[PDB]
Symmetry: C3
Amino acid sequence: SGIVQQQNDLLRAIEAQQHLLQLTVWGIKQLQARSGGRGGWMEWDREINNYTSLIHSLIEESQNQQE
Amino acid sequence: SGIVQQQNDLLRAIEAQQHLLQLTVWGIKQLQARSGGRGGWMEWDREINNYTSLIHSLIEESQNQQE
Amino acid sequence: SGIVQQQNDLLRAIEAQQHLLQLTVWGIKQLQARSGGRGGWMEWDREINNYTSLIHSLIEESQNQQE
C-alpha cells in the first residue's frame, strides 16, 4: 500500500544515513591515526562496531519482515 | 500489526543510529581538545545539543504514540 | 491515521539526524583543514555529497508521497 511504500522510503533513508555515518567514522579514524597508534580508541571502536552490527540486524529484519 | 512491527524496527534503527551519532560527536570533541580549549566550538556544541534534544523528543513521542 | 502520525515522526527524526550528521561532517572538515589543503579528501567529499543528495531525495519523496 501507500503506507508500505512510505516505510520502504524511510528504510532507504536510514540505509543511506548509515553509509554517511560510516564515512564520518572513517574520517575520524584517519584523523586519529595522524597522531599515532589508535590504541586509546579500542573501546570507542568496539562500541561503534557493536552499534553498527545492531543497525545491520535491524536493517536486515526490516527488509525481511514479510519476505 | 505487521506495519506496526515494521515501524518499531525503524524506530529502533533510528535509536541505534543516534547512539552511533553521539559516539562520532564525542570522537570529534576529543580531537578538537587535542589542540586546546574548545571555545571556538561553543556554537557547534549548542547546535549539536539542540538537534539531540529534538531527536530525543521525537523518539519519546514515537514510543508514547498510543501509550 | 495513527500509523501516519507515526511515520511523520520517524521522518522528522531522520531529518533531525541528517542535520546532526551534516554538523559532524562540518566538524571533521574543519579538523582536516587544520593540517592543510583538503585535497586528499576529494573522494571522501564526493561520497558524502552523493549520499547527502540521496538522502535529500528520499526525504523529498517521503514528504511528497501523497501530496
